Design a protein around this nucleic acid. Structure first.
Lengths: 258, 71, 175
RNA sequence: GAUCUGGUUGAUUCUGCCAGUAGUCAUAUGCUUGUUUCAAGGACUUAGCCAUGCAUGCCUCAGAAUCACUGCAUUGCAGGAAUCUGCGCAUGGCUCAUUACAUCAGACGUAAUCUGCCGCAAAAAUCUUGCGGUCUCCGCAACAUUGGAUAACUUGGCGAAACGCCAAGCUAAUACAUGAACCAACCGGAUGUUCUCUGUUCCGGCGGCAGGGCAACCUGCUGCCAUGGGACGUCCAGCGAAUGAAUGAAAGUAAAACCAAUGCCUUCACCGGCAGUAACACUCAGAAGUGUUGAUUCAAUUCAUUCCGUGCGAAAGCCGGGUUUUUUUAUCCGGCGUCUUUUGACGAACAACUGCCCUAUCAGCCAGCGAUGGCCGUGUAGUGGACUGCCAUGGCGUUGACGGGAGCGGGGGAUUAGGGUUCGAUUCCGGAGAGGGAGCCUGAGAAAUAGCUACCACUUCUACGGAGGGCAGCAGGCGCGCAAAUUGCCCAAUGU
RNA sequence: CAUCCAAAAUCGAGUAACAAUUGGAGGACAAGUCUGGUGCCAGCACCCGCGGUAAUUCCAGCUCCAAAAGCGUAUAUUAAUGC
RNA sequence: CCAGAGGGCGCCCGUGAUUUUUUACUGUGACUAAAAAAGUGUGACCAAAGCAGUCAUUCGACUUGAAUUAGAAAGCAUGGGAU
């Protein structure tokens, strides 16, 4: 049992300093893990800057003014992972968090339609009392599951005010993917060949726009859509392309003139 | 690994051999380990035969593997 | 302080290990339950999940099952006869899993009657069936040899099965 | 910045040590000092001994208010102490004494397991209450007017002291103990000497009677059944748990006749042939013929037996808001809270593929008292010589066992052309410990010491009858040593 | 710490007494063939060595050299070490 | 809703080697917390540091920035065919 987290045992992706206290908030058990997530008070304070310090944060949160997934959240700390939607009425802002190139969390801004749309992977599929089929994901169960039954590793489309499930998408060649984990995340690609190694980690081989193809595992893959015109959701300014270190550097120089 | 001794009842004894590297000298060195594994009465492999085995939950004090396949 | 570890034991090399630690509640034995014949007594304890278990003491009553007829019905354990762990356990009339004991027989005898409109069923069921001669002699006489297949120190009940040809001859020849 | 110099002779060329020289968050010790930024600091010897003070508590619109308590109002409203209740104190801090298939790091596993708070998702069991009569048991209704206790407080007190204690009298609940019909479904079992479609149906069976009846059987008489389905009645059925059966797809030849059925054509026909053809006795003409994994004695399903406190309430709960017109509705709407089941991640426990100082003036080490393995058990959350009984004779080692010495492990630091040598008590990560040993309670989690019990060592108060203590938490002492700070200020920041 | 000594309106260096030290000067190793005192004594010296009346080394003056708000001394360890 | 007939591909299973073959090595990828180290950018008045911050005469714009690498042995995938 551990109730304390510290600044040097916390991820780099939150971008907290070495200095300025020796403690960081430990998010609770929730829809997502401790080693990837962004906790509430970290978002509000250190990003959107509607809080300057700890007291400020809870003086927002505890009044029910912040809502991930349509449910108001009183708690100071509570994790928010990949592919969630944060809606704070008072401003008129809406976020859909995501990863972006350089492996680091990013924030999109979305309108009406996509403030009710989400996506969910499938981790496992199992059977419960009365022969009722069940799925399990990151965030939550939810029950049965047609849209038409099928299989693990596939990706659904979930609506949050009520279920209207548009279809789903599967893991098959020529489709499109965004990545998590593995120091390869914040990219986007196609799906070429998937190697299967029994009893052992399963290795995928991918591609992306204008070549520079690559590879990862298969539990770091999260499907997005059939094609890159077929996407249900919006994406950052970068389209999941890494470009070379030298290219980047050079460009930053040339444009700095102002 | 290979086989070293057929003794006991259903419990055979494996030897392994493999190398090691010391960075300073830049030369290699030989070492062995040994393991005490389970052998089904289905097989009856002889000393010096190769074998392939598998991981398992503890079946005895030392014994943590069980034979799959003989060569 | 009863412990379950390899710490107090020797190495494979005949050496002896040195500790640097006390002992935990993670490792934990508790003293054996010895479950005899007599009126039901129970001695509930608590485990490491907050889940009780029921240490049984003295069980005279049972539940026993045919294979092949796919039923189970009650009965009363009468005497203990054979145990293969020790002859100690026999003489004390204690009960452990895979112990061989004796039962009332009555509910089985009863039920096998039934193996109006009913009058047709008693033909159809009795067709395509025989009962062992091994089993027969016993069942008639009013006592049977049965085997408890439950662990009756950690559930506080005895349940069992019943012995047909193969198993049965292996036991009888001991006696 | 891949470098050198002085000293053996009367003088010379070598070999080889001694001495010089530069760093070191690497410590001490003298001399010396004007500004400013930054920062380690009783670890080395003693994990030795400690005076005093502080170091963990928590209330909102939302669990219990008759302070003999306060304000305002004059029979109400708002504050409301310390008490019951719920949650937490197993985290954080501090210290390296023990400790080499030990710990630990990299990479893996749990299909061998437990898991409070948190996320998401479920839930169709139960003869209860009021009225009237009474025969114990009924008739008549329907939104459950449940039950018994205990603190604070008062009354007597006891004691030298004590985070010591007693008798009596009062009253609460989201404490504790009970208990909910119809409303309210789908699906399956076992059955009646129930009656009615019926046997179209005999050869056998079940019998039912008399004569001989020893009820062996022979004879005569007689009823029903020998493919079936419709209605009516009775007992059982939920979640979770135990035991025994069954299910948990298949994937290696090709055309006719035989009888038992039985379907469809077809005919006046229950006449004699195969064109059509998911399944199947109506009501439901598709209301699962199809779980995941590399792998399952797993998930889940069906049937038979069972469950007794050691499991299962709609808290018999709380608060708002709109209404309504009487403030004051079974009027609607919302926010909280909790029992049970299921599985994620916050964790815990267990297992080991590879690797690491010195020593042979340590060469044999392991079974009476488990050493290696086997079989049935026992125990535990679970796997296992973890342990009992019984049976075998194995296991390890000169590619350094066993024993001893030094030592908490790692990320890393110093020095450096390169190869290396050396250090790591100490900010982060893992482990262990709280004077020395052991044992235990509570709890989801502890062998917890600002928890308990006992002994040993040390020690305090006493009216001698007894009652206590544990700084390797922060300050501050004492002792020790070559050597290390204030008996400050504050929750503003960073967290719990 | 930073800013300022009036925006109408607010101080102050001359021996700049508001005054740097700690180890050295035969060799190794940058720097005195200077002047007194001592006379194998007292002491210095990591090493080689100096001192017996002209002591380049001791004890002190004066001058000079190295580093500088720092500079010596011991102990341990690394480099120097292809010891 | 162009039929019959062999072809060809993608999943799944079963049967077949006279003995099927493998590692060290090396190329390219998988996997792997910070602090520290290496390194890109930036006039904290330089600096040791730190991840900041710079413009705009306006109720904000940079769709701000916080790159990138290293990490013995062992483990994992896929190429090479010399020793």
């Amino acid at each position: 049992t551990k109730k304390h987290l510290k600044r040097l045992y916390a991820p780099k992706d939150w971008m907290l300093s070495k200095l300025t206290g020796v403690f960081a908030p430990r998010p609770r058990a929730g829809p997502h893990k401790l080693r990837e997530c962004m906790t509430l008070m970290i978002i509000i304070r250190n990003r959107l800057k509607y809080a300057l310090n700890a007291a400020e944060a809870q003086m927002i949160l505890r009044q029910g003014l912040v809502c991930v997934d349509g449910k108001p959240r009183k708690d100071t700390k509570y994790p928010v992972g990949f592919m969630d939607v944060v809606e704070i009425p008072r401003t008129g802002d809406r976020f859909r968090i995501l990863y972006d190139v350089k492996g680091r969390f990013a924030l999109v801004k979305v309108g009406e339609a996509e403030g009710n749309i989400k996506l969910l992977k499938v981790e496992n599929v199992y059977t419960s009392t009365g022969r009722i089929p069940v799925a399990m994901t990151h965030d939550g169960h939810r029950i049965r599951y047609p849209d038409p039954r099928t299989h693990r590793g596939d990706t659904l489309v979930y609506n949050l005010k009520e279920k209207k499930v548009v279809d789903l998408i599967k893991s098959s060649n020529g489709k499109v993917v965004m990545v998590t984990g593995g120091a390869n995340r914040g990219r986007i690609g196609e799906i070429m060949s998937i190697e299967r190694h029994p009893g052992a980690f399963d290795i995928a081989r991918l591609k992306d726009a204008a070549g520079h193809e690559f590879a990862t595992r298969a539990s770091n893959i999260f499907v997005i859509g059939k094609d890159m015109q077929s996407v249900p959701v919006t994406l950052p300014k970068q389209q999941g392309l890494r470009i070379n270190v030298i290219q980047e550097r050079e460009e930053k120089l040339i444009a700095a003139e102002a | 690994g290979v086989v070293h001794s057929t003794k006991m009842k259903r419990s055979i004894v494996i030897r392994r051999d493999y190398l090691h590297f010391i960075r300073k000298y830049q030369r290699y060195q030989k070492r062995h380990r040994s393991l005490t594994v389970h052998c089904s009465p289905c097989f009856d492999p002889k000393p010096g035969d190769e074998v392939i085995v598998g991981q398992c939950r503890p079946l005895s004090k030392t014994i943590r593997y069980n034979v799959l396949e003989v060569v | 302080g009863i412990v379950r570890s390899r710490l107090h034991k020797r190495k494979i090399t005949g050496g002896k290990t040195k500790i640097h630690r006390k002992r935990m509640k993670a490792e934990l034995g508790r003293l054996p339950a010895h479950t005899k014949l007599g009126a039901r007594r129970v001695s509930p304890v608590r485990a490491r999940g907050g889940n009780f278990k029921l240490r049984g003491l003295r069980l005279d009553t049972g539940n026993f099952a045919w294979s092949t007829e796919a039923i189970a019905q009650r009965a009363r354990i009468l005497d203990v006869v054979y145990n293969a762990t020790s002859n100690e356990l026999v003489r004390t009339k204690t009960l452990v899993k895979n112990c061989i004991v004796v039962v009332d027989a009555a509910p089985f005898k009863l039920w096998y009657a039934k193996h109006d409109e009913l009058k047709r069923k008693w033909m159809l069921r009795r067709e395509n069936h025989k009962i062992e001669k091994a089993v027969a002699d016993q069942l008639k006489e009013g006592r049977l040899l049965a085997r408890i297949t439950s662990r009756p120190g950690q559930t506080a009940r005895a349940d069992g099965a019943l012995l047909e040809g193969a198993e049965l001859q292996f036991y009888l020849k001991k006696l």
